[PDB]
Write a protein that binds this DNA or RNA. Structure first.
Ligand SMILES: [Mg+2]
Ligand SMILES: [Zn+2]
Ligand SMILES: [Zn+2]
Lengths: 62, 822, 96, 46, 48, 116, 42, 470
RNA sequence: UAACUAGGGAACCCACU
């Protein structure tokens, strides 16, 4: 049952939640992916602090 | 109990129940076919009538008063399509391939997952190695056909060597000798007669001696019951009303399975003596400890016990509401109106909520799951699924492991490999859960033979004879255990008195014989081996090949004394031949004392592990992973899929039966609704696109229809007649008239706001034109707002078919099934 | 209208990404720093992320229905940052 | 202007109105099936 | 409550401040390809 | 007895003298159940409207005034059991008060309300 | 910065509409604040 | 002495509970099951629970047995404390009334005629009805012609009228209602209700002087506030101590040259600076205009916020746009492109503003919104204003010096100087590689068009020269 | 002579890793 048209999604500045101005959840509501805690740790490890600022502030909810 | 109200008294009593056929209505009584109940999101539920009798005395009876609607699982004896021929089912748009066993609740197909539990009324000895107790006994005592739940008594030895008891509704650790004195047994010699059955082993008497010497201060029944009533969950006022609360606890709270009556003092005393004696044997090690995971120690609550446990509380709540109504309408002096007394929503909406949601109460969840209709294998495997009640995310392994007593009753391979390994299981093929019968013919048969009851014995002849139990409760003693077990088996190989499901177990090392007649035990049929020969002779195969002619069924072979159902307790006392061609021929002999023979070893597997070719040649994690994937394969999941408005239907163009098949696929009907295509694989390193678990496919084969599937998705929407402030209605919305209308194509819609079938739609195309009115259209020029369901974005396809109907509420209601080939 | 599609120096144009753009590619669970690395975009027809074979081992990604997450760096500054720190040639040898 | 629906079990066809309760005339069957569209369909035979 | 709005793994600190939903991101299945370099990913057109 | 107890909630009136709460039917048919011999409102409706109150606050079902501290605070201990009012708005005319004082009954007000 | 008499909430801050939303439909925090102000007026 | 015990009861049925307990006391006062309690209290305003006077809790439980209305207080009882038992029986306490029940709850009713039978009074009300049109509501005037048009239960006597449940109106409702069904004490209507039919305001931070006493001419800033005798704590000039003054001794004095606002009267809402402080006439100039505003000293306050003083594009009709210059209660004052200030209703339409629109001046230079332009011709020739909105041939100019219309006027732009069809149409690709495919046009341009193909799962774009409709 | 944005949550269940 796991087809790739059912699983593909991308997103760019689409619908935004009302409780906080972060993107939606899930591909059915055109939501974006979660940049979770472990990715925050991994980008600390890279030392990409401008990329980490771009993810966690600018391209999520400025 | 018949409820009584004190003024002239009157009592209500309910005596004879009536269960009609499922029927919908406002409207006239008409038989609701279950596919109609699936399509209009109805609830396939039969109404439930009962007669009333009231005495005020001035009695009046009230025949066939409507209690309420209870749901019916399909292919029952009270469904409409019981026993119908396959032509008749295909006239009803129901397929004959569907096994039933699921409820239709609001059009949704629900499956009651069988829930494991510890076996009731059975003494267990466990070791809390972390607590202050060395060995703790317990007995989850629960009387059959009793509205009250189980009430576990604990009898536990302290680790330091006194023995105490945790009783129900009593918060302190009561000593054992206090409870025996509180049952009217004042002598230490008499209590020691009820506990230790031999006075010639001084070691066990020396071990019970400190617990006996704890409570030599309290000697009277009065003082003992006073100490029982001290530190209750409901504490006592004085000497008065605390003697009665303690008498109530010893009468009605501990051990209801040995009886709740005034003469049941000594029976309860004998069974508590048995609990303390088994705890002493565990503290000696003369009997081993008990396993929590042995499946002779468990029961399976199926839909019968689950709906019974639900209906106890809901019928009691309906009685409580009738009592509230009668308390209101006697104090006005008038007479109550009984049809307004019994409100039907408390007995029907509760069943509908507990089956529709799965929150099993007003407690636990996940009991009624939505039926999985991707594959016929997934549908069968969802109807044969057991749920361990142990919660998830536990770091321990012993409730999850494959215990030895899962042999033949439950599949070893099939389990969800996520965080529910081993907890959720799938039943084996020939295993069958005993639906349970009444113990009373067995008790009459035992009193017919020379069994001596507990209220008529000396406590001296107990240890030289075998203690005999029925459903846990100890019914007496018998002197000659052989020729009793031969007689009970001789009656089960004939079905004279004892039902085939009922199980005898002679414990031979410790002199016990226990007969279980519970509802929930899990058995499987085995052949029967006299001296070293099967009883399955050639004439049975000759009469059994010629079925539909001789009318010689399986049940005639159970009646012939050839096969019989063995449960898990009785597997501990059986010598089981694997196959007859090896294990009745003389060799350097292994045992030569076989009692039963396995029918075929392939029947130890589940329904999804039966479709695996050569699964003994695989590795066992691979068998588990295929058991997961076989529930997910696309295929023709049902025969009437063109009628069904299922959400997410995956069907396949050209499914094939396997060239390499098992014999057991003939019985799952996998060659009739298959899932997958025979393909000429090659196992080759190649260009490098089959690298790390991927496969190279043939484009020309795929262009010839190879695994080209088709994915259906339905879309339901109804309008809502409300209090005039917002009013949905299906219509084609207009840009100049409607407000908030999203930028999409609305000329695909027809004149009623729906798509005609055979129309291409894509992502964010409208499928249902629906407009809801706006209350401030007068409070200008801008009226009713768009509330439309679009096609699900990043999907596309042709609208397969559209049905238009009325719902349960009488409101217009449309379903649209949209087809997309894959 | 075509009158405001003119471009003078200083406008931004949010254009669809082409070949040679840099993306961040990771797999939950991101255990170490080579579970989230920077790739260059190649536009291929069918609807999957075709990625190479030797990058399976840091990702622990065995293509049997694994799906990966692809982040795009929006500024040009963070694009140069990913190119100079988190490229998979610069993450061949691990520090652990 | 009326929409033609196929009467479920009856398999006959009938008109329908806006704000009309959904009932067959033959036996009052509640499930209607909307007829196939009148515009053209064309399939690439691939 | 407010303390229950903040205290969870799904709360404000961990659930929204630490790990948050991001724009400009895609998620699809990977399939192998040996005909492109180790720092190239072949993304679809409808993602791009 | 039960004859003192009001039959319904409609037109409940408290007396001006002893704050006895009864319906207008019971004042019309029985007078005052404590001191009608000093007031004589039985057989006259206008005497009831002059001698009972249309505004009262709080009721007391005085069952045993011989052993009640509430009867000590409300000064109704020497009376009969019945339904009494805590606060009574109203006043007798000067003719009735002077006639009661000529019979040795000084009129103490049952208006025990804290007026601001 | 931190005074012990300020720990006793003698005036309760009610947060704005950005914190608790409205979607016609109220927030759970608005229901509990309704309990606050109802018992306060009582 | 016995004590009082709280027993929870049914709400609204506490008086009947005391009546039933008194009947139960008299019915069993000679029997062998006596009520050993002493009294039962059900107050006038305490709603939800009653009081039992007894020496024991067990006497209360054995006395309330058989009473269903107290069943939520049957298991446990709570004693009123000893110091608090007097708080039980403690009671506190052409006109206008407000009706108690019905749809006219707490609405202002003018008491027209007091009927001396002491049952009802005639009340003049404003009808909260929908004139039998929605029901098969705010206060608005009684429209007799609408209820003669819509029909129903209606009877006309010229201006006198009977309608809809025996409602009596004339010219304005005149209906009888009970004195116990109205509150004849504590209404106090306002001035808008007079058209339909001292005070102290000290604020923290304001400056006040002392007019009388030994502490005279001490000016200090206000810390706290109370009702009548405030006992204020003013921070005076050159005094570290906090003195005490009531409200009758103080007065809102303000030094010349400060932020002032007006609290009430004709001059409210307006701000400014005061100029010269007389004995009581305090003259000021506003932040908006330079008109002399003379106020009482009590009608001033000290507030440091900037004045408010808005300016939207609304459509007077689809031929002529307008610009709002004044926000009012029920109307807008709107300045169109003609220059004619009009007064229109709230229910004009909001036009989409073109913030990138281009216009030409008299000297053929490109001008836009927010441009400071001089007027060299027309009726407004000589002024200089900022462009706020644009039309095909008109431009609206704002000027903070020009006090008329909030600064807005209009000039023609040539008197200034700077200082698809194919959508949703089934097409057939008749040329190219996709030739012969039937699809539906999703998007379309001058050049190309996106076609949802009926056959494949894909939407592709082709030229319009390649498409042929059905 | 083109009127241009999106709206909830909470629980359970299943699946993927
Ligand atoms: Mg994988
Ligand atoms: Zn028909
Ligand atoms: Zn009196």
């Amino acid at each position: 049952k796991h087809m790739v048209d059912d699983k593909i999604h991308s997103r760019a500045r689409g619908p935004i939640q009302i409780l906080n101005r972060q993107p939606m959840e899930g591909r059915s509501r055109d939501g974006g992916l979660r940049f979770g805690e472990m990715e925050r740790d991994c980008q600390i490890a890279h030392g990409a602090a401008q990329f980490l600022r771009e993810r966690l502030f600018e391209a999520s909810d400025p | 109990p018949p409820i009584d109200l004190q003024p002239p008294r009157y009592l209500l009593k309910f005596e004879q129940i009536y269960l009609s056929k499922p029927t919908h209505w406002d409207g006239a009584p008409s038989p609701m076919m279950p596919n109609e109940a699936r399509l209009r999101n109805l609830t396939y539920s039969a109404p439930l009538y009962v007669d009333i009798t009231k005495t005020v005395q001035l009695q009046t009876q009230h025949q066939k008063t409507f209690i309420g609607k209870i749901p019916i699982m399909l292919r029952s004896t009270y469904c409409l399509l019981n026993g119908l021929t396959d032509r008749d089912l295909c006239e009803l748009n129901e397929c004959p391939l569907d096994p039933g066993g699921y409820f239709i609740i609001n059009g949704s197909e629900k499956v009651l997952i069988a829930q494991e539990k510890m076996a009731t009324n059975t003494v267990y000895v466990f070791a809390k190695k972390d607590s202050k107790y060395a060995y703790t006994g317990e007995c989850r005592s629960c009387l059959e056909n009793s509205s009250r739940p189980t009430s576990t008594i604990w009898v536990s030895m302290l680790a330091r060597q006194r023995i105490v008891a945790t009783l129900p509704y009593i918060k302190q650790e009561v000593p054992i000798i206090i409870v025996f004195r509180a049952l009217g047994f004042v002598s230490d010699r008499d209590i020691l007669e009820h506990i230790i059955y031999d006075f010639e082993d001084p070691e066990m008497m020396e071990m019970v001696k400190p617990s006996l010497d704890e409570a030599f201060v309290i000697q009277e029944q009065n003082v003992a019951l006073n100490f029982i009533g001290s530190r209750g969950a409901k504490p006592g006022v004085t000497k008065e009303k605390r003697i009665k609360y303690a008498k109530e606890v010893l009468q009605k709270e501990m051990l209801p399975h040995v009886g709740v009556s005034d003469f049941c003092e000594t029976k309860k005393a004998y069974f508590l003596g048995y609990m303390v004696h088994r705890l002493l044997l565990a503290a000696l090690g003369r009997r081993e400890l008990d396993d929590r995971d042995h499946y002779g120690n468990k029961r399976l609550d199926l839909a019968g016990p689950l709906l019974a446990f639900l209906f106890r509380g809901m019928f009691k709540n309906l009685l409580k509401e009738v009592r509230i109504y009668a308390q209101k309408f006697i104090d006005r002096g008038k007479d109550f109106n009984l049809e307004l007394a019994i409100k039907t929503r408390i007995i029907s909406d509760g069943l509908k909520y507990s089956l529709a949601t799965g929150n099993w109460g007003d407690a636990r969840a996940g009991v009624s799951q939505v039926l999985n209709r991707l594959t016929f294998a997934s549908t069968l495997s969802h109807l044969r699924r057991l749920n361990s009640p142990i919660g998830r995310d536990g770091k321990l392994a012993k409730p999850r492991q494959l215990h030895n007593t899962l042999w033949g009753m439950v599949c070893p391979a099939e389990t969800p490999e996520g965080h529910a390994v081993g907890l959720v299981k799938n039943l084996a093929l020939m295993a069958y859960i005993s639906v349970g019968s009444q113990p009373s013919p067995i008790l009459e048969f035992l009193e017919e033979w020379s069994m001596e009851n507990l209220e008529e014995i000396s406590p001296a002849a107990i240890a030289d004879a075998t203690k005999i139990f029925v459903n846990g409760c100890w019914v007496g003693i018998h002197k000659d255990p052989e020729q009793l077990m031969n007689t009970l088996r001789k009656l089960r190989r004939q079905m004279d008195i004892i039902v085939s499901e009922v199980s005898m177990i002679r414990d031979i090392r410790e002199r016990e014989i226990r007969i279980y007649t519970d509802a929930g035990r899990i058995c499987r049929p085995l052949l029967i081996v006299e001296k070293q020969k099967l009883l399955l002779k050639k004439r049975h195969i000759d009469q059994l090949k010629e079925r539909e002619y001789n009318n010689y069924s399986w049940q005639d072979l159970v009646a012939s004394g050839v096969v019989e159902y063995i449960d898990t307790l009785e597997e501990e006392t059986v010598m089981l031949a694997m196959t007859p061609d090896d294990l009745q021929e003389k060799e350097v002999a292994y045992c030569s004392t076989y009692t039963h023979c396995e029918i075929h070893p392939s029947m130890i597997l589940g329904v999804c592990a039966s479709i695996i070719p050569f699964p003994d040649h695989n590795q066992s994690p691979r068998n588990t992973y295929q058991s997961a994937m076989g529930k997910q394969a696309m295929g023709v999941y049902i025969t009437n899929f063109h009628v069904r408005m299922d959400t997410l239907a995956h069907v396949l163009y050209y499914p094939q039966k396997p060239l390499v098949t098992t014999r057991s696929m003939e019985y799952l009907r996998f060659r009739e609704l298959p899932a997958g295509i025979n393909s000429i694989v090659a196992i080759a390193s190649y260009t490098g696109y089959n690298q790390e678990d991927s496969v190279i496919m043939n484009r020309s084969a795929v262009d010839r229809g190879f695994f080209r599937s088709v994915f259906y998705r339905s879309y339901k929407e109804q309008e809502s007649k409300k209090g005039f402030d917002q009013e949905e209605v299906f219509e084609k919305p207009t840009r100049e008239t409607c407000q908030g209308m999203r930028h999409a194509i609305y000329d695909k819609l027809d004149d009623d706001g729906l798509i005609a079938p055979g129309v291409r739609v894509s992502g964010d195309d409208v499928i249902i034109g629906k407009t809801v009115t706006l209350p401030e259209n007068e409070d200008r020029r801008y009226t009713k707002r768009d509330c439309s369901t679009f096609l699900r974005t990043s999907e596309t396809g042709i609208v397969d078919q559209v049905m238009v109907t009325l719902n349960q509420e009488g409101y217009k209601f449309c379903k649209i099934r949209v087809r997309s080939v894959r | 209208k075509p009158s405001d599609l003119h471009l003078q120096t200083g406008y931004k144009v949010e254009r669809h990404m082409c070949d040679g753009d840099i993306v961040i590619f990771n797999r939950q669970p991101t255990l170490h720093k080579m579970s989230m690395m920077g790739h260059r975009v190649r536009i291929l027809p069918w609807s999957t992320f075709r990625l190479n074979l030797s990058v399976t081992t840091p990702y622990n990604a065995d293509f049997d229905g694994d799906e990966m997450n692809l982040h795009l760096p929006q500024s040009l500054e963070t694009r140069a940052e990913i190119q100079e720190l988190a490229m998979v040639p610069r993450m061949i040898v691990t520090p652990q | 202007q009326p929409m033609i629906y196929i009467c479920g079990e009856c398999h006959t066809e009938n008109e329908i109105k806006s704000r009309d309760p959904i009932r067959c005339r033959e036996c009052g069957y509640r499930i209607m099936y909307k007829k196939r569209t009148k515009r053209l369909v064309v399939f690439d035979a691939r | 409550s407010l303390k229950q709005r903040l205290k969870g793994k799904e709360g404000r600190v961990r659930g929204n401040l630490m790990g948050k939903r991001v724009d400009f991101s895609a998620r699809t299945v990977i399939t192998p390809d040996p005909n492109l370099s180790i720092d190239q990913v072949g993304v679809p057109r409808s993602i791009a | 007895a039960l004859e003192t107890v009001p039959k319904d909630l409609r037109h409940l009136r408290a007396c001006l003298l002893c704050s006895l709460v009864k319906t207008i039917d019971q004042f019309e048919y029985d007078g005052c159940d404590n001191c009608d011999a000093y007031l004589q409102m039985k057989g006259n409706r206008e005497m009831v409207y002059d001698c009972t109150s249309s505004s009262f606050d709080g009721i007391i079902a005085m069952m045993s005034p011989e052993d009640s501290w509430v009867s000590k605070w409300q000064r109704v201990s020497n009376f009969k059991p019945g339904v009494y009012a805590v606060s009574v708005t109203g006043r007798l005319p000067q003719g009735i008060v002077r006639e009661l004082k000529s019979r040795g009954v000084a009129y103490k007000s049952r208006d025990t309300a804290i007026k601001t | 910065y931190a005074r012990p008499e300020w720990m006793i909430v003698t005036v309760l801050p009610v947060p704005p509409l950005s914190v608790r939303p409205a979607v016609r439909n109220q927030d759970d925090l608005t229901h509990k604040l309704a309990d606050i102000v109802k018992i306060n007026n009582q | 002495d016995p004590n009082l015990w709280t027993v929870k009861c049914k709400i609204g049925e506490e008086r009947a509970t005391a009546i039933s307990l008194m009947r139960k006391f008299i019915a069993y006062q000679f029997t062998d099951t006596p009520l050993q309690i002493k009294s039962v209290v059900a107050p006038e305003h305490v709603k939800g629970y009653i009081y039992v006077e007894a020496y024991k809790q067990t006497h209360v439980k054995q006395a309330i047995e058989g009473v269903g209305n107290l069943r939520l207080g049957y298991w446990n009882q709570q004693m009123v404390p000893i110091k608090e038992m007097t708080d039980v029986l403690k009671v506190v306490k052409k006109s206008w009334v407000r009706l108690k029940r019905g749809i006219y709850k707490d609405d202002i009713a003018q008491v027209d005629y007091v009927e001396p039978s002491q049952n009802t009074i005639s009340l003049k009300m404003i009808p909260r009805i929908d004139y039998d049109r929605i029901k098969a509501p705010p206060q608005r005037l009684f429209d007799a012609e609408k209820i003669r048009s819509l029909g129903g239960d209606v009877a006309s006597d010229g201006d006198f009228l009977i309608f809809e449940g025996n409602r009596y109106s004339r010219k304005f409702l005149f209906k009888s209602f009970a004195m116990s069904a109205v509150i004849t004490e504590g209404v106090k209507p306002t001035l808008s209700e007079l058209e339909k039919f001292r005070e102290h305001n000290f604020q923290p931070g304001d400056n006040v002087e002392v007019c009388e006493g030994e502490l005279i001419n001490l000016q200090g800033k206000i810390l706290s506030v109370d009702g009548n005798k405030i006992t204020i704590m003013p921070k005076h000039e050159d005094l570290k101590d906090m003195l005490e003054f009531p409200a009758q001794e103080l007065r809102k004095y303000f030094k010349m040259g400060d932020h002032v606002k007006v609290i009430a009267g004709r001059f409210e809402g307006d701000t400014g600076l005061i100029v010269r402080v007389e004995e009581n006439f305090v003259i000021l100039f506003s932040d908006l205009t330079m008109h002399e505003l003379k106020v009482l000293p009590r009608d001033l306050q000290l507030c440091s916020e900037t004045a408010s003083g808005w300016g939207e594009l609304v459509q007077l009709d689809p031929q002529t746009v307008g610009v709002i210059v004044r926000l009012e209660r029920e109307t807008f004052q709107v300045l169109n492109m003609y220059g004619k200030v009009v007064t229109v209703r709230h229910q004009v339409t909001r036009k989409k503003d073109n913030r990138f629109a281009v216009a030409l001046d008299s000297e053929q230079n490109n001008i836009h919104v927010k441009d400071i332009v001089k007027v060299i011709d027309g009726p407004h020739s000589g002024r200089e204003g900022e462009i706020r909105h644009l039309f095909r041939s008109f431009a609206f100019l704002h000027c903070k010096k020009l006090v008329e219309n909030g600064g807005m006027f209009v000039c023609k732009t040539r008197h200034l100087v700077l200082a698809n069809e194919l959508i949703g149409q089934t097409v057939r690709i008749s040329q190219g590689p996709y030739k012969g495919y039937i699809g539906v046009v999703k998007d379309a341009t001058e050049s190309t068009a996106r076609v949802e193909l009926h056959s494949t799962c894909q939407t592709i774009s082709v030229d319009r020269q390649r498409l042929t409709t059905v």
